[PDB]
């Protein structure tokens, strides 16, 4: 992006650039992701494939079409886009979790396996052996939902503050 006038156009550039975008998505750095997209020129977002694919993955992931995100696995412009697809699957699982523990009531074992695209059923225990949302009640996958006293001290602080700014001379 810097020595633009002097540097000759490098056709062997978009590959690494989009691979960087994929890396940002992989480590859930959405802010930096969109900053670099903005840095990129406008046309490349819709013309090139190397960049379009990471753009497509991020767009799908923000919409919530995780099924499309997964189905995109086979669709990869160049094999270089590797190991970040894997870190991206891991991060997607983490985000699916985030959803589950922020806003659900309880997910049974079969439905947890269905929703979270875990590893083989035997390792399906994964992410409960790792995150462990206080699981266990009734069925081991009860999800243990992770969902009134006057704050007298704080109210006293604030009211005293009113009095202080009203009585001080200024």
């Amino acid at each position: 992006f810097d020595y633009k006038e002097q540097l000759p156009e490098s056709a062997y550039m978009h590959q690494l650039l989009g691979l960087n975008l994929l890396f940002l998505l992989s480590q859930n750095r959405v802010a930096e992701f969109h900053t670099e997209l903005e840095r990129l020129p406008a046309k490349d977002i819709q013309t090139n494939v190397y960049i379009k694919h990471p753009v497509s993955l991020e767009q799908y992931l923000m919409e919530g079409s995780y099924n499309k995100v997964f189905l995109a696995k086979g669709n990869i412009p160049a094999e270089s886009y590797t190991f970040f697809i894997d870190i991206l699957l891991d991060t997607i699982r983490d985000e699916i979790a985030g959803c589950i523990e922020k806003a659900y009531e309880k997910i049974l074992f079969t439905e947890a396996t269905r929703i979270l695209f875990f590893n083989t059923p035997k390792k399906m225990t994964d992410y409960a052996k790792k995150r462990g949302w206080v699981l266990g009640p009734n069925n081991y996958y009860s999800f243990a939902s992770q969902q009134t006293t006057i704050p007298s001290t704080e109210l006293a602080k604030q009211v005293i503050e009113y009095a202080r700014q009203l009585e001080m001379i200024v």
């Binding site: 001290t153 006293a156 602080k157 005293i160 503050e161 009095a163 202080r164 009585e167 001080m168």
Partner: protein, 94 residues
């Protein structure tokens, strides 16, 4: 014995105490209130008794020590709020 925080007495609690099945705990609390020993009310839809008072009696040394401990805790609370207010209003105390 019970402090005011949870002085709500349940009928099952009374029954497990002095041995009467829970259909005359109402009459027991009735007579208790009538004699002037305990003031309050009976809310039997949810089966509870709100005792707001008790006939003060003569206690033992152990019970007086219990009261002393409770006074200690109360004093700690009072001093804490005292210090907080005096520290946060230092400029407007005449």
């Amino acid at each position: 014995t019970r402090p005011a925080n949870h002085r709500q007495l349940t009928f099952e609690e009374i029954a497990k105490s002095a041995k009467i099945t829970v259909n005359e705990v109402e009459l027991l609390v009735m007579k208790a209130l009538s004699v002037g020993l305990v003031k309050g009310s009976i809310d039997e839809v949810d089966k509870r008794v709100h005792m707001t008072w008790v006939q003060p009696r003569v206690l033992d040394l152990q019970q007086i020590k219990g009261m002393k401990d409770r006074l200690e805790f109360w004093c700690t609370d009072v001093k804490s709020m005292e210090m907080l207010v005096e520290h946060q209003a230092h400029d407007i105390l005449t």
